[PDB]
Design a protein around this nucleic acid. Structure first.
Ligand SMILES: [Zn+2]
Lengths: 148, 264, 149, 166, 108, 95, 292
RNA sequence: CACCAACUUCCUAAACUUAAAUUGGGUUAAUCUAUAACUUUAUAGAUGCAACACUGUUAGUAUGAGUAACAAGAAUUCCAAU
């Protein structure tokens, strides 16, 4: 599958945490139905937990649009341009709350196999080994077998 | 169309110019051959004496045909006719650059037309100053026997009574074969014609008539050193120390016009 | 395996080849220009040239009369050979027949076609090839060489 | 059956803006029903690919195969419409961009034999597709010289990245 | 003996697309100066030959009518004359064929 | 299944690569791989094999110093073996 | 520096082209009827002063373009690339015409002009080389001749065999580059300014202006190089297939300057020559060619 | 005078102990009906409701393979001609 699947290296969006941490998620859209068994858990979530999340994270734009809808859906947009959609069809309040928290923590970075879990811009401090390292010199820089 | 087209030498030659071209080619060939007639007068390379183990150069000849020959003993022996045509040294190879054991010399004969030949072949021959030859063959020659390129070779190099080895391509028999080089060993030479450069060789020679063959001294152990009493480098008509007879005969050979042989 | 062969295998047998060649020769004499396959035309070209020699030999020749009768099925042609073809070619020493290549037949077999005709005939001239003129640049350059020589 | 090749000739491009090069003409021509094998016809198509209009026509005139005559007829029809409908100024300024053949609807019959055997008889039909681009055929590719190969090999070595290392 | 397995299209494609099996281009194409049509270097023109062959039939058709019967090949030389051309003294004692058309430019 | 099987062997293969690189680096300094590991253990050094490769590649000067410590402990270890245990522990062998 | 002369010379050539283009407003349709032996009577409506004979060849077939080297407009020899001027009768000239004498001269002139280009750029910029004129010699002479005057510093310098080979390499590069022959008819006054430095070129320009009632002179430009032409020239440099600098002969009365006449031979792609034939022609082309 | 080597074992996070007829328990794709929903969903009630495999049945298209295979007497002035 790895041969048939893509991979990447460790990277950061714009060195987010160097100066101050910025939340990647920027906009949340919620679709609900007044009368739908699938939206029952979402219906209760709006009553109780939606306000708490908004107060906890006031920097994410939240859109709640109750409308006649077959399947409730949640759309999350990230600063880097990543957009993710999650179906809320017949999911409980607790499931919804956990999912939103996971979405906020997650970044727009692609989720694929990472070849190296470590990223460094200055891997060497004392200099990278080269063949001439540890090779003893000779007087006058005489090459081997040189009669001179 | 801006595309390649097929061309031949006669495509753009007019009838009047075509006749002139034919005459010019004959004149050019004659002039080139005459210029190379005198090797000894062309800064010849140093001449060395014969010593045991020396190997002389060979010649290329055309298979004219066969005829019957009678000896003074009354025996009849069939013989084959070989003609040496425009035999000239072309390229000498140094001993080190070809083979440490012995040096080699390239000899070509039977001049051919220049109309349907590659430019590269013509360019090499232009430098040598000779018309192109049908076949190139390589002869193993010792350093002492090396001859400068462009030296004309004549049928008089060999002499009657000398055994020789001839190699030629066998006749091809088609899908069933043939068309492979083969050598016949131990063929005696009965007579040589100086005027027409014709050598009479005992036995049969592989190949069809009018086919070029390679002639070289016999390599059998018995005839290890036969060149001691023969022209060591080669026979030079340029020297003309003593004009040779037009026809050379072996002692046993019964010459025509001789008295009828009586077994007394 | 066609090495050294001097005869083509035509018809259903050697006799058929002679008869087929006989028919071709008779037709050529009557018309003086015939189109046929290149292989057959080449084979019959030699026969036609020799026939003209027989006509040149003379009418009184018994062998020529027998030869003419056998080769020419139509007997009206026998006077023609001795009185038309033979007089015409008296000056010529040979090359009585002209054979040229014709575009291959578009008959789904793509046979090689050639036309054989008797020279000096009254028929319209065939479209023969014309050699390049000496006025061409290359020929003119050779002309300058000729003048120098 | 699908006839999208013809629709390619019905495509209309938007009006060219002043800052746009003159669009080269593209002509698609095909013959849907030909009593000829596509496989045999493909041989003709493959050779003529990339050749000029005149060179391809000249070769076809001296070709022995029946398909070649059909191809020349197809080429002539495409050329006629190109000047008539695609505003082609110079007839000679055409080359064969694409040439390929496709399968066509066939007919099925039973092949009788003299000894009571039978066989499957088929009447083969094929389609032929060609696209003609106004202008001379593109210049041929030049094989890479030894110097070019060596430079790339050195470049490839430099481009190498260390595998499975810190 | 029957094939042990189906032959792959890729294997089949390589065989048919091998250079030995592909159709080769011809470089011997030439132009006919007389008709301006294409020809091969070793092949004659056909557009003009069409005139020559048809003219021969027309001449032959005139000859056939004049003879009027089979086995009537003359024992004397024959000549063809076109309208506007009058027999000469040298034409005496030769079969004369009269053609309604004028002397063709190519025909001399 | 092949990917699932490769998960187990992949970790083992990576460990083998790290050991091989250490052996090549150690031999260049004249120290065998078993000696270097044993001396480091005797020095209460708990660096893992992966990090050991990393230090040599990017910290050759530090690795040489690390080689000296292993060599010095090896010298003390040889002295202890020659001493037969009667001699006190070496300065660098103190734990 | 010689490069400076080429830059200004090129500009005046470019400015003259623009003036002529501006001179003609809009595209005027001219009915040109084909009087050529093949496909006679075809009439093309072409743009005046823009359309060239090569466009008509493109209209008919690719064979016409390849085999047409010159055009006869109303019985007058016209360059295949020279823009048409008015309704006229056009015929195409090929290398295989029954009388190629007119065609040969155009090839003869173009080869001489090409040779002149090689001489000026063959030497280093330090040396000073002035072209005097291109002598017109018959094809029968066996070589085309170009006269050039060298500086006193080169009085003792003669090309060697290797130097002659280098000149062919430069000429062969020009043929490989395949530069089309630009054609401009310019008045003497402008032409004199363009070639003011070369006094020898000044007189040649005057001669052409004297012959015709006006001062218009025929100027041909090969890339940067520009020169006067006695008549029509080859459309492109790629026509030549074999090229050789046979020999150079120094004129005896050459005290003020060393006047050298260079001998060369060239053959078009349409007319290739055998290796042996070419060698003989080159040998026959190494002899001094006088004008008779 | 050792190292290497098994998920055996330890370690971070977890996990809570070794084949296959048969037997116990929990889910689910698709279609229709009842009642809802309204870009294709829910709860019930139903069923011609899930196929990499029966020398399976029907249709299509390959492979063998462009292979086996097959064909008109001559010339001309012309196929209801000589
Ligand atoms: Zn014609």
């Amino acid at each position: 599958t790895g041969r048939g699947t893509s991979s990447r290296f460790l990277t950061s969006v714009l060195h987010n945490g160097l100066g101050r941490y910025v939340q990647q998620l920027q906009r949340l859209s919620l679709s609900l139905s007044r009368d739908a068994p699938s939206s029952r858990g979402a219906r209760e979530f709006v009553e109780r937990e939606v306000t708490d999340f908004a107060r906890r994270n006031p920097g994410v734009v939240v859109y709640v649009n109750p409308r006649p809808c077959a399947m409730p859906r949640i759309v999350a947009e990230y600063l880097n341009g990543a957009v993710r959609e999650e179906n809320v069809n017949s999911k409980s309040v607790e499931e919804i709350k956990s999912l939103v928290q996971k979405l906020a923590d997650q970044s727009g970075l692609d989720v694929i196999r990472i070849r190296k879990p470590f990223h460094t811009d200055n891997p060497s401090i004392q200099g990278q080994w080269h063949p001439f390292t540890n090779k003893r010199t000779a007087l006058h820089g005489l090459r081997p077998r040189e009669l001179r | 169309l801006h595309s390649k087209s097929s061309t031949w030498w006669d495509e753009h030659l007019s009838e009047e110019n075509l006749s002139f071209v034919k005459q010019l080619v004959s004149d050019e060939n004659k002039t080139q051959l005459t210029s190379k007639l005198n090797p000894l007068k062309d800064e010849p390379w140093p001449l060395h004496p014969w010593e045991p183990g020396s190997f002389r150069v060979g010649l290329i000849a055309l298979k004219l045909g066969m005829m019957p020959l009678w000896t003074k003993d009354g025996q009849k022996h069939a013989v084959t006719l070989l003609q040496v045509q425009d035999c000239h040294v072309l390229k000498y190879t140094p001993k080190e650059d070809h083979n440490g054991k012995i040096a080699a010399l390239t000899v070509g004969g039977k001049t051919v037309s220049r109309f349907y030949k590659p430019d590269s072949r013509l360019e090499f021959y232009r430098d040598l100053g000779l018309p192109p030859k049908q076949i190139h063959k390589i002869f193993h020659v010792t350093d002492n026997a090396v001859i400068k390129p462009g030296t004309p070779l004549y049928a008089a190099h060999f002499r009657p009574g000398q055994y020789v080895d001839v190699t030629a391509k066998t006749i091809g028999k088609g899908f069933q074969m043939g068309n492979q080089n083969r050598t016949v060993y131990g063929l005696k030479v009965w007579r040589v014609n100086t005027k027409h450069n014709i050598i009479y060789v005992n036995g049969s020679v592989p190949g069809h008539k009018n086919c070029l063959v390679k002639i070289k001294d016999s390599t059998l152990p018995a005839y290890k050193d036969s060149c001691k009493n023969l022209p060591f480098p080669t026979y030079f008509p340029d020297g003309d120390e003593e004009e040779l007879p037009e026809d050379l005969f072996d002692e046993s050979v019964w010459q025509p016009s001789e008295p009828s042989i009586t077994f007394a | 395996i066609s090495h050294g062969r001097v005869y083509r295998r035509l018809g259903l047998g050697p006799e058929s080849r002679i008869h087929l060649l006989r028919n071709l020769l008779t037709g050529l004499v009557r018309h003086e220009r015939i189109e046929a396959t290149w292989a057959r035309a080449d084979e019959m070209r030699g026969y036609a040239e020799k026939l003209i020699d027989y006509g040149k030999l003379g009418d009184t020749n018994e062998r020529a009369m027998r030869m003419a009768d056998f080769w020419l099925t139509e007997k009206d042609l026998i006077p023609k050979l001795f009185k038309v073809l033979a007089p015409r070619f008296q000056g010529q020493n040979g090359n009585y027949t002209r054979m040229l290549q014709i575009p291959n037949r578009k008959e789904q077999d793509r046979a090689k076609m050639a036309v054989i005709e008797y020279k000096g005939n009254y028929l319209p001239p065939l479209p023969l090839p014309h050699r390049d003129s000496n006025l061409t640049l290359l020929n003119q350059l050779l002309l300058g060489l000729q003048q120098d020589l | 059956i699908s006839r999208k090749w013809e629709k390619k000739n019905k495509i209309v491009y938007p009006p060219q803006l002043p800052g746009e090069p003159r669009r080269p003409a593209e002509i698609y021509h095909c013959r849907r029903q030909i009593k000829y094998s596509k496989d045999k016809m493909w041989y003709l198509a493959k050779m003529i690919r990339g050749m000029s209009i005149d060179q391809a026509l000249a070769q076809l005139e001296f070709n022995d195969k029946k398909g070649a005559q059909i191809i020349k007829e197809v080429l002539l029809e495409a050329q006629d419409m190109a000047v008539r409908d695609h505003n082609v100024e110079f007839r000679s300024n055409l080359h064969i961009a694409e040439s390929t053949s496709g399968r066509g609807q066939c007919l099925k019959r039973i092949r009788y034999h003299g000894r009571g055997r039978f066989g499957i008889m088929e009447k083969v039909y094929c389609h032929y597709f060609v696209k003609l681009v106004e202008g001379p055929p593109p210049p041929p590719e030049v094989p890479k010289t030894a110097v070019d190969h060596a430079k790339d090999y050195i470049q490839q070595l430099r481009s190498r990245t260390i595998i499975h290392t810190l | 003996a029957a094939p042990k397995n189906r032959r792959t299209i890729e294997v089949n494609r390589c065989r048919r697309r091998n250079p030995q099996k592909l159709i080769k281009i011809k470089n011997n194409i030439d132009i006919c100066p007389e008709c301006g049509h294409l020809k091969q270097k070793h092949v004659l023109c056909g557009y003009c030959y069409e005139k020559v062959r048809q003219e021969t039939t027309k001449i032959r058709q005139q000859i056939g009518a004049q003879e009027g019967g089979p086995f009537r090949a003359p024992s004397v030389e024959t000549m063809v004359l076109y309208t506007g051309e009058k027999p000469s003294e040298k034409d005496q004692g030769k079969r004369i064929v009269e053609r309604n058309i004028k002397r063709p430019s190519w025909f001399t | 299944v092949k990917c699932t099987k490769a998960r187990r062997l992949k970790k083992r293969n990576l460990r083998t690569l790290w050991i091989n690189r250490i052996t090549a680096a150690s031999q260049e300094h004249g120290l065998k791989y078993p000696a270097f590991i044993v001396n480091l253990i005797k020095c209460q050094v708990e660096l893992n094999r992966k990090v050991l490769v990393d230090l040599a590649i990017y910290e050759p000067k530090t690795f040489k110093s690390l080689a000296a410590l292993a060599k010095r402990r090896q010298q003390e270890g040889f002295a202890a073996a020659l001493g037969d245990g009667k001699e006190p522990e070496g300065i660098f062998s103190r734990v | 520096s010689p490069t400076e002369l080429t830059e200004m010379r090129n500009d005046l050539f470019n400015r003259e082209k623009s003036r002529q283009l501006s001179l003609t407003p809009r595209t005027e349709k001219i009915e040109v009827k084909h009087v050529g032996k093949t496909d006679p009577g075809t009439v093309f409506v072409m743009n005046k002063n823009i359309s060239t004979p090569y466009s008509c060849a493109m209209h008919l077939s690719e064979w016409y373009c390849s085999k047409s080297i010159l055009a006869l407009v109303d019985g007058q020899p016209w360059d295949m690339y020279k823009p048409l001027t008015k309704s006229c009768e056009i015929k195409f000239l090929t290398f295989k015409d029954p009388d190629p004498k007119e065609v040969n001269k155009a090839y003869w002139r173009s080869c001489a002009m090409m040779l002149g280009c090689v001489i000026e750029r063959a030497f280093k910029d330090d040396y000073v080389v002035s072209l005097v004129r291109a002598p017109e010699v018959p094809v029968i002479a066996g070589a085309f001749c170009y006269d050039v005057t060298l500086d006193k510093r080169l009085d003792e310098w003669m090309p060697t065999k290797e130097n002659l080979r280098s000149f062919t390499k430069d000429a062969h590069a020009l043929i490989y580059r395949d530069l089309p022959f630009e054609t401009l008819d310019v008045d003497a006054r402008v032409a004199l300014e363009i070639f003011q430095h070369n006094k020898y070129k000044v007189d040649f320009i005057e001669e052409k202006a004297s012959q015709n009632p006006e001062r218009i002179v025929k100027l041909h430009r090969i890339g940067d190089f520009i020169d006067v032409s006695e008549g029509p020239l080859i459309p492109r440099t790629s026509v030549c297939f074999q090229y050789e600098v046979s020999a150079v002969h120094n004129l005896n009365p050459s005290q003020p300057n060393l006047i050298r006449r260079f001998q060369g031979l060239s053959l078009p792609t349409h007319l290739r020559a055998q290796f042996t034939i070419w060698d003989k022609l080159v040998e026959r082309s190494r002899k001094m060619v006088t004008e008779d």
